[PDB]
Design an enzyme around this catalytic site. Sequence first.
Site, PDB file in Angstrom:
ATOM      1  N   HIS A  46      -6.827  -6.728  -1.483  1.00  0.00           N
ATOM      2  CA  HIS A  46      -6.006  -5.673  -1.155  1.00  0.00           C
ATOM      3  C   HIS A  46      -4.781  -5.968  -0.069  1.00  0.00           C
ATOM      4  O   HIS A  46      -3.807  -5.508   0.056  1.00  0.00           O
ATOM      5  CB  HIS A  46      -6.563  -4.295  -0.642  1.00  0.00           C
ATOM      6  CG  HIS A  46      -5.703  -3.298  -0.522  1.00  0.00           C
ATOM      7  ND1 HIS A  46      -4.741  -2.717  -1.723  1.00  0.00           N
ATOM      8  CD2 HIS A  46      -5.435  -2.333   0.591  1.00  0.00           C
ATOM      9  CE1 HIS A  46      -4.295  -1.743  -1.037  1.00  0.00           C
ATOM     10  NE2 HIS A  46      -4.397  -1.466   0.094  1.00  0.00           N
ATOM     11  N   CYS A  51      -4.628   9.581   3.851  1.00  0.00           N
ATOM     12  CA  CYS A  51      -5.172   9.404   2.525  1.00  0.00           C
ATOM     13  C   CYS A  51      -4.995  10.515   1.813  1.00  0.00           C
ATOM     14  O   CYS A  51      -4.830  10.154   0.542  1.00  0.00           O
ATOM     15  CB  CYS A  51      -6.673   8.881   2.758  1.00  0.00           C
ATOM     16  SG  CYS A  51      -6.713   7.129   3.828  1.00  0.00           S
ATOM     17  N   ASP A 108      -8.546  -5.984  -6.700  1.00  0.00           N
ATOM     18  CA  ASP A 108      -7.919  -5.074  -5.548  1.00  0.00           C
ATOM     19  C   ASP A 108      -9.129  -3.660  -5.662  1.00  0.00           C
ATOM     20  O   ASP A 108      -8.791  -3.121  -6.767  1.00  0.00           O
ATOM     21  CB  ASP A 108      -6.721  -4.808  -5.550  1.00  0.00           C
ATOM     22  CG  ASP A 108      -5.949  -4.008  -4.561  1.00  0.00           C
ATOM     23  OD1 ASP A 108      -6.644  -2.912  -3.836  1.00  0.00           O
ATOM     24  OD2 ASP A 108      -4.960  -4.143  -3.955  1.00  0.00           O
ATOM     25  N   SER A 137       0.846  -1.112  -0.031  1.00  0.00           N
ATOM     26  CA  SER A 137      -0.036  -0.010  -0.091  1.00  0.00           C
ATOM     27  C   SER A 137       0.972   1.282  -0.225  1.00  0.00           C
ATOM     28  O   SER A 137       1.786   1.336  -0.960  1.00  0.00           O
ATOM     29  CB  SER A 137      -0.810   0.082   1.169  1.00  0.00           C
ATOM     30  OG  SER A 137      -1.570   1.262   1.806  1.00  0.00           O
TER      31      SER A 137
END
Length: 263
Positions: free
Chosen positions: A242, A186, A213, A92
């Site tokens: 994911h 984020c 994903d 990630s």
Amino acid sequence: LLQILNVRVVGSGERVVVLSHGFGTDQSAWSRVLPYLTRDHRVVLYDLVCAGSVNPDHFDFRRYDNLDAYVDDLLAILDALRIPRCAFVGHSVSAMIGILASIRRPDLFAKLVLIGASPRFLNDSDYHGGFELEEIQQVFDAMGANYSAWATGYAPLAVGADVPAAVQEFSRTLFNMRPDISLHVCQTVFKTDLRGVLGMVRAPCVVVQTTRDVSVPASVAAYLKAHLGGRTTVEFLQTEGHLPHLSAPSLLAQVLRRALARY
């Protein structure tokens, strides 16, 4: 910093591997794959400064405006430990951090393994990242208006497969993040675009691709293989999600053992 970011060194070996977790988790996300690596490698684990398991009063919203500051931490850790060379596995946001760190310090990064990985989440002209501006705007709003409802709905979508224990676990750590820090991370991720620097990576790289994903379109792994500057391969897992280290850890460990065999 070794203490603040909960650094742990486990296993032993001349082959050192750093496991760097993604958004919404901490280093505990690696616990199921960990037993497959410690016989053979010295494994360095740590928590990103945004993790719920780190005291959130360490989070400097100014400094961590930019993924460079997370790279700073990773490099300060490895230098503190006197490690000259390692393989690095990043999920990630940590896949982005490993790309950047391998460019800053090509001596240090002998191989990257990138899970849940993208150079850019927003769509652009003939670039399919998988997200639109207005769509993310609404997500950032939902994170602010009701973090817990947002996290409840996001956890099963990220895990993807119907694996309730993995949903429970990712939920546990997503609920652990301070909601202001979760939104700020984020936002930072969604402002990052590494497309232009991918050719500067010199390390060999394995891009792990699952069959679906929510955050990474299928076409991203080929884009990384075409643009990363080192010898790159895409390795396919026969399941979706994911977070395969949570949802299919035995399968992911097969790819990790093969990728970490020589470097």
